[PDB]
Curated annotation (Swiss-Prot):
Molecular function, one GO term: 5'-3' DNA exonuclease activity
Source organism: Homo sapiens
Transmembrane segments: none
Protein name according to UniProt: DNA cross-link repair 1A protein
Leader sequence segment: none
Gene: DCLRE1A
Sequence similarity: Belongs to the DNA repair metallo-beta-lactamase (DRMBL) family.
Disulphide bridges: none
Keyword Translocase: no
Residues of the full protein shown: 700 to 1040 of 1040
Induction per the UniProt record: During mitosis. The mRNA encoding this protein contains an internal ribosome entry site (IRES) in its 5'-UTR. This 5'-UTR generally suppresses translation while specifically promoting expression during mitosis, when cap-dependent translation may be impaired.
């Protein structure tokens, strides 16, 4: 049955709640983004109204076959009315199409649900700056001080420089990038752009990417693997066996693989700077794990909350153990005492 932290009090709404069958009293289902742990349950047989971004709505129609009459895409940064309640969608700085949702309840309460987000100071100048928020439903994925990671910009610099060096030393090396969901597209697109190649991929992944409004996508991606020296493969195939196999399939076009696994976090971060990262190597295959995150670090999360000063925080992640919950609640109290709210 539906957990309380997916339910918006004083409305008929739910958020990211499609795996519970018909939720009692739900008149509209919102979807923050197209990741399977959040859309799980949607299909062509869903007949309740779904509210979401334009990009998310493209993906629902084309990938899951949800019928068009039930998809209600909303523009960003725009006050809209849903079943008599004012809502706004804000950019979540997560994956393409991912939003945060502001709800303005009829009794004066204002609620922000972050969905999945990577907090950024740019958010301190959206429609959030303009009123008080009473309740924050917060993506607490990395809510512990050990989770530090570099900016996305520093991680993409490292990846472009590494790949450009490798292919310039050996014009017969192939670059491979792992993927399993939308998100982290900058990794493979920035590498392709520095090498003057398109990114080659399966027809299914190409279709997914064409749903995203990314300018000049026909320009950067392709299904013709032969013509490309940057290949996208499932994340599961990013190991020595999977990559030796792929290299066999390229018919002696290539004699080395440099592969990237963009992970969220790995405990290498506590002891290492980005500059100091090294691959795992076997034979003519090297694998780099790079800390490209689409969730807030601990310090990013803390800053956002100390700026917003909500009255009540409801975590949405790590809520299944008493130790995790207690840890998070202790950090929330620290933040509030330090900031004076
Ligand atoms: Ni997500």
């Amino acid at each position: 049955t539906c957990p309380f932290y997916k339910k918006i009090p004083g409305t008929g709404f739910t958020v990211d709640a499609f795996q519970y069958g018909v939720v009692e009293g739900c008149t509209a289902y919102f979807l923050t983004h197209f990741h399977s742990d959040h859309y799980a349950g949607l299909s062509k047989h869903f007949t309740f109204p779904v509210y979401c971004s334009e990009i998310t709505g493209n993906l629902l129609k084309n990938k899951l076959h949800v019928q068009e009459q039930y998809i209600h895409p909303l523009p960003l940064d725009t006050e809209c009315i849903v079943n008599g309640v004012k809502v706004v969608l804000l950019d979540a700085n997560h994956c393409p199409g991912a939003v945060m949702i502001l709800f303005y309840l009829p009794n004066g309460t204002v609620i922000l649900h972050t969905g999945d987000f990577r907090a950024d100071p740019s958010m301190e100048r959206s429609l959030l700056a303009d009123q008080k928020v009473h309740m924050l439903y917060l993506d607490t994925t990395y809510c512990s001080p050990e989770y530090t990671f570099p900016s996305q910009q520093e991680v993409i610099r490292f990846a472009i420089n590494t790949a450009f060096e490798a292919v310039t030393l050996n014009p017969h090396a192939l670059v491979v990038c792992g993927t399993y969901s939308i998100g982290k597209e900058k990794v493979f697109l920035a590498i392709a752009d520095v090498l003057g190649s398109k990114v080659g991929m399966s027809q299914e992944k190409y279709k997914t990417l064409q749903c995203l409004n990314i300018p000049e996508i026909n320009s950067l991606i392709t299904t013709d693997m032969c013509s490309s020296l940057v290949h996208l493969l499932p994340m599961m195939q990013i190991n020595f066996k999977g990559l030796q196999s792929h290299l066999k399939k390229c018919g002696g076009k290539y004699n080395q693989i440099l592969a990237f696994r963009p992970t969220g976090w790995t405990h290498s971060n506590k002891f290492t700077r980005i500059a100091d990262v090294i691959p795992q190597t076997k034979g003519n295959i090297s694998i780099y794990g790079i800390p490209y995150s689409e969730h807030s670090s601990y310090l990013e999360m803390k800053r956002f909350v100390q700026w917003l000063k909500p009255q009540k925080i409801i975590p949405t992640v790590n809520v299944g153990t008493w130790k995790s919950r207690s840890t998070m609640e202790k950090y929330f109290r620290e933040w509030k005492l330090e900031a004076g709210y």
